[PDB]
Design an enzyme around this catalytic site. Structure first.
Site, PDB file in Angstrom:
ATOM      1  N   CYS B 133       0.851  -1.187   0.000  1.00 52.30           N
ATOM      2  CA  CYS B 133       0.000   0.000   0.000  1.00 52.30           C
ATOM      3  C   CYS B 133       0.889   1.240   0.000  1.00 52.30           C
ATOM      4  O   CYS B 133       1.423   1.620   1.045  1.00 52.30           O
ATOM      5  CB  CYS B 133      -0.930  -0.019   1.202  1.00 52.30           C
ATOM      6  SG  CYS B 133      -2.358   1.047   1.060  1.00 52.30           S
ATOM      7  N   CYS B 136      -0.430   4.083   1.901  1.00 50.37           N
ATOM      8  CA  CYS B 136      -0.444   3.721   3.311  1.00 50.37           C
ATOM      9  C   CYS B 136       0.870   4.061   4.013  1.00 50.37           C
ATOM     10  O   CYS B 136       0.884   4.844   4.969  1.00 50.37           O
ATOM     11  CB  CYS B 136      -0.773   2.228   3.431  1.00 50.37           C
ATOM     12  SG  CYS B 136      -2.480   1.819   2.950  1.00 50.37           S
ATOM     13  N   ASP B 137       1.980   3.482   3.549  1.00 50.34           N
ATOM     14  CA  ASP B 137       3.274   3.656   4.198  1.00 50.34           C
ATOM     15  C   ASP B 137       4.298   4.365   3.319  1.00 50.34           C
ATOM     16  O   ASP B 137       5.471   4.451   3.702  1.00 50.34           O
ATOM     17  CB  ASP B 137       3.823   2.298   4.644  1.00 50.34           C
ATOM     18  CG  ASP B 137       2.738   1.369   5.159  1.00 50.34           C
ATOM     19  OD1 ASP B 137       1.956   1.795   6.034  1.00 50.34           O
ATOM     20  OD2 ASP B 137       2.668   0.213   4.688  1.00 50.34           O
TER      21      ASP B 137
HETATM   22  C1  FAD Z   1       0.348  -4.044   5.121  1.00 53.95           C
HETATM   23  C2  FAD Z   1      -0.853  -3.170   5.375  1.00 53.95           C
HETATM   24  C3  FAD Z   1      -0.679  -1.804   5.556  1.00 53.95           C
HETATM   25  C4  FAD Z   1      -1.767  -0.966   5.793  1.00 53.95           C
HETATM   26  N1  FAD Z   1      -1.534   0.387   5.968  1.00 53.95           N
HETATM   27  C5  FAD Z   1      -2.559   1.163   6.191  1.00 53.95           C
HETATM   28  C6  FAD Z   1      -2.313   2.581   6.372  1.00 53.95           C
HETATM   29  O1  FAD Z   1      -1.215   3.133   6.339  1.00 53.95           O
HETATM   30  N2  FAD Z   1      -3.454   3.320   6.598  1.00 53.95           N
HETATM   31  C7  FAD Z   1      -4.747   2.828   6.660  1.00 53.95           C
HETATM   32  O2  FAD Z   1      -5.674   3.621   6.870  1.00 53.95           O
HETATM   33  N3  FAD Z   1      -4.969   1.491   6.493  1.00 53.95           N
HETATM   34  C8  FAD Z   1      -3.923   0.710   6.265  1.00 53.95           C
HETATM   35  N4  FAD Z   1      -4.141  -0.639   6.075  1.00 53.95           N
HETATM   36  C9  FAD Z   1      -5.517  -1.154   6.184  1.00 53.95           C
HETATM   37  C10 FAD Z   1      -6.359  -0.956   4.929  1.00 53.95           C
HETATM   38  O3  FAD Z   1      -6.971   0.334   4.924  1.00 53.95           O
HETATM   39  C11 FAD Z   1      -7.461  -2.018   4.896  1.00 53.95           C
HETATM   40  O4  FAD Z   1      -7.985  -2.053   3.575  1.00 53.95           O
HETATM   41  C12 FAD Z   1      -8.619  -1.821   5.882  1.00 53.95           C
HETATM   42  O5  FAD Z   1      -8.193  -2.171   7.199  1.00 53.95           O
HETATM   43  C13 FAD Z   1      -9.835  -2.644   5.506  1.00 53.95           C
HETATM   44  O6  FAD Z   1     -10.883  -2.426   6.476  1.00 53.95           O
HETATM   45  P1  FAD Z   1     -12.241  -3.231   6.407  1.00 53.95           P
HETATM   46  O7  FAD Z   1     -12.983  -3.229   7.693  1.00 53.95           O
HETATM   47  O8  FAD Z   1     -13.068  -2.720   5.224  1.00 53.95           O
HETATM   48  O9  FAD Z   1     -11.778  -4.709   6.046  1.00 53.95           O
HETATM   49  P2  FAD Z   1     -10.893  -5.671   6.943  1.00 53.95           P
HETATM   50  O10 FAD Z   1     -10.403  -4.943   8.142  1.00 53.95           O
HETATM   51  O11 FAD Z   1      -9.820  -6.291   6.042  1.00 53.95           O
HETATM   52  O12 FAD Z   1     -11.880  -6.807   7.345  1.00 53.95           O
HETATM   53  C14 FAD Z   1     -11.428  -8.170   7.483  1.00 53.95           C
HETATM   54  C15 FAD Z   1     -12.159  -8.828   8.620  1.00 53.95           C
HETATM   55  O13 FAD Z   1     -13.159  -9.730   8.087  1.00 53.95           O
HETATM   56  C16 FAD Z   1     -13.084 -10.945   8.790  1.00 53.95           C
HETATM   57  N5  FAD Z   1     -13.617 -12.017   7.949  1.00 53.95           N
HETATM   58  C17 FAD Z   1     -13.341 -12.270   6.630  1.00 53.95           C
HETATM   59  N6  FAD Z   1     -13.975 -13.307   6.135  1.00 53.95           N
HETATM   60  C18 FAD Z   1     -14.726 -13.765   7.205  1.00 53.95           C
HETATM   61  C19 FAD Z   1     -15.624 -14.844   7.338  1.00 53.95           C
HETATM   62  N7  FAD Z   1     -15.925 -15.684   6.346  1.00 53.95           N
HETATM   63  N8  FAD Z   1     -16.206 -15.026   8.546  1.00 53.95           N
HETATM   64  C20 FAD Z   1     -15.908 -14.186   9.540  1.00 53.95           C
HETATM   65  N9  FAD Z   1     -15.081 -13.140   9.529  1.00 53.95           N
HETATM   66  C21 FAD Z   1     -14.519 -12.985   8.325  1.00 53.95           C
HETATM   67  C22 FAD Z   1     -11.615 -11.097   9.176  1.00 53.95           C
HETATM   68  O14 FAD Z   1     -11.456 -11.971  10.290  1.00 53.95           O
HETATM   69  C23 FAD Z   1     -11.274  -9.654   9.558  1.00 53.95           C
HETATM   70  O15 FAD Z   1     -11.556  -9.369  10.925  1.00 53.95           O
HETATM   71  C24 FAD Z   1      -3.057  -1.516   5.849  1.00 53.95           C
HETATM   72  C25 FAD Z   1      -3.236  -2.883   5.669  1.00 53.95           C
HETATM   73  C26 FAD Z   1      -2.147  -3.717   5.432  1.00 53.95           C
HETATM   74  C27 FAD Z   1      -2.370  -5.194   5.241  1.00 53.95           C
END
Ligand code: FAD
Ligand code: FAD
Lengths: 306, 306
Positions: B133, B136-137
């Site tokens: 990302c 992100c970083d």
């Molecule tokens: C390396 C890295 C760097 C990042 N850097 C940044 C940054 O600088 N700034 C920033 O704002 N964000 C950052 N992010 C996060 C990024 O914004 C993500 O896209 C965000 O956290 C997604 O949020 P979300 O709630 O939409 O999805 P997620 O947080 O990805 O939701 C996934 C969740 O769904 C659950 N889940 C999935 N399938 C199932 C299932 N079948 N049954 C039950 N539970 C399930 C998982 O257990 C998990 O808890 C980073 C992420 C990564 C990996």
């Protein structure tokens, strides 16, 4: 960059500040033109418990906790009250009452303003028993008595939403009939926890300098005043978007809210609008933060494709 | 309410947790079904400096600071891995590997997963020199040398975006030509700070257990390995939305992302999708927070108009 910014952001609310955070973090020339205190409508809110990452926090300290990380990223803060923003294609001008700045992109984050009732004590107990936002402070007044001012769709729907916390909700209105939809009228008359006081106007809001304790209600027909005990008052009379400085641009709707799409961008290329100044339904810090992030990151894309 | 929730939220990332905050705060029966640790992709991020209200904070502590205010609002947390969600009009079912729950509304917040390269050391130094990302970083690696893996639109555009901080950006790709658009190819060849290594594959990522210090690059044609010094590596190979449990519902696109509108609502009435599992462009905590707020507050409206 001083002679021509990558981005100027009109407004320093959650939206404007988030757009400044993202845009500046992407190594772009960013300046915020703000009339007054950084925070916007936030500086008027007692407690906020629906911003993720913070159990409870007040308007000013959250505004500052959003502002201070900007200095690290070279966001230049400029005092000014914007009177006009004009478009020149490759560049845009933003005019102060005494200055004027050029930028490649303008992000409009001027928000809106809650219209008021004109009642003594409403200013005083605002966000201490007086509120213009049921989604905002409705969860604070659990199992109390609440007064809702109005007779349109907003007052009725916000009242039955308030039934989810209060023991009783009475609405005042200066007429004997409601102007709302008959479906919501029936829905209100059907709910037990809502009753109404017809042909009446709020005269004055009274409390103990801490909370709202009671309200004097005058009847428009008779003219006699009677006091009623209420833990809270919620007023919705409409809201005024701050769009006086973009009247020339035909980016607003009939009511004056700026029209954008998924990407926060306006019919005028290079100018964006975020936050509550927008045509939208849910106006919260969380929505202004989403929005501001989208515009702040979109500035880089618009600049790169040049 | 245990036999039939007002809302079940599949996923405990920023989006799911914000929807739970708003929905529960509105006095509704809310439960989150989560497979594992509350936080999602956040628990893999070292430092986060683009979430408003927090100068710097780590993934886990921000996840917890978003989770703990939920217990106050009676959000019931349920462990489970959802295999199927089926619609019945007035109600919907969500099936575990050993249980099954009924709700009037489903909010899908399962997010996505960054595809990986399969290289030893990439897991190890993830978010410590390895990143998927740039938005992100990218601002952490100012004036350093960065390696970008890929040869599509994503790798090229993310590389020239990375030129806004790094002193040099070299991209690896296992071929002698780019598959990206010729406009972005020309834009890359034009930028001074980007050069490329053709017909090569990342062999292994190496560092000092703290940061990424160097990478071994193998050439697909010759087969010989040469080490290069890089402060960072950014890999984009695609992403996998977690939508296996909604294949039956025809709410996804060809690539499997859920289609919604302004209001987070799906072609199936009563089921919503928020966060990164969505068809959208900018995937951040700030966007997931906007989204989650919209769905959590929309649940009440959908329920009331019943
Ligand atoms: C390396 C890295 C760097 C990042 N850097 C940044 C940054 O600088 N700034 C920033 O704002 N964000 C950052 N992010 C996060 C990024 O914004 C993500 O896209 C965000 O956290 C997604 O949020 P979300 O709630 O939409 O999805 P997620 O947080 O990805 O939701 C996934 C969740 O769904 C659950 N889940 C999935 N399938 C199932 C299932 N079948 N049954 C039950 N539970 C399930 C998982 O257990 C998990 O808890 C980073 C992420 C990564 C990996
Ligand atoms: C009583 C009350 C209670 C609230 N409760 C909550 C709550 O519980 N939860 C919650 O999340 N939010 C709450 N809010 C805030 C609400 O979400 C607001 O809609 C939100 O703060 C708007 O953010 P914004 O950045 O889009 O606009 P604003 O923050 O309103 O932006 C206004 C800014 O624009 C500037 N500006 C305007 N015109 C000009 C001009 N011509 N030149 C220069 N600067 C200009 C102003 O100086 C100000 O800084 C509350 C607000 C009020 C008033």
């Amino acid at each position: 960059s001083n002679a021509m910014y990558d981005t100027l952001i009109i407004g320093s609310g959650p939206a404007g500040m988030t757009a400044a955070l993202y845009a500046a973090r992407s190594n772009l020339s960013v300046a915020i033109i703000e009339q007054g205190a950084p925070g916007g409508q936030m500086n008027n809110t007692f407690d906020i418990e629906n911003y993720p990452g913070y159990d409870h926090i007040s308007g000013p300290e959250l505004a500052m906790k959003m502002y201070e990380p900007l200095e690290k990223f070279n966001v230049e803060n400029i005092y000014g009250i914007v009177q006009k923003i004009e478009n020149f294609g490759d560049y845009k001008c933003v005019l102060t009452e005494d200055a004027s700045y050029e930028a490649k992109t303008v992000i409009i984050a001027t928000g809106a303003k809650y219209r008021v009732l004109g009642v003594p004590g409403e200013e005083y107990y605002t966000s201490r028993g007086v509120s213009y936002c049921a989604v905002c402070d409705g969860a604070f007044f659990r199992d109390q008595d609440l007064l809702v001012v109005g007779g349109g769709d907003s007052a009725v729907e916000e009242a039955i939403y308030l039934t989810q916390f209060a023991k009783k909700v009475t609405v005042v209105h200066r007429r004997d009939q409601l102007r709302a939809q008959k479906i919501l009228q029936d829905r209100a008359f059907a709910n037990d926890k809502v009753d109404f006081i017809w042909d009446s106007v709020v005269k004055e809001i009274q409390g103990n300098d801490i909370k709202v304790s009671n309200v004097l209600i005058e009847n428009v027909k008779t003219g006699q005043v009677t006091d009623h005990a209420f833990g809270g008052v919620f007023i919705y009379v409409g809201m005024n978007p701050v769009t006086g400085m973009v009247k020339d641009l035909e980016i607003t709707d009939s009511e004056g809210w700026i029209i954008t799409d998924d990407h926060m961008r306006t019919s005028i290329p290079g100018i964006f609008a975020i936050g509550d100044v927008r045509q939208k339904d849910l106006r919260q810090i969380t929505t202004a933060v989403g929005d501001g992030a989208i515009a702040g990151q979109g500035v880089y894309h618009y600049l790169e494709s040049f």
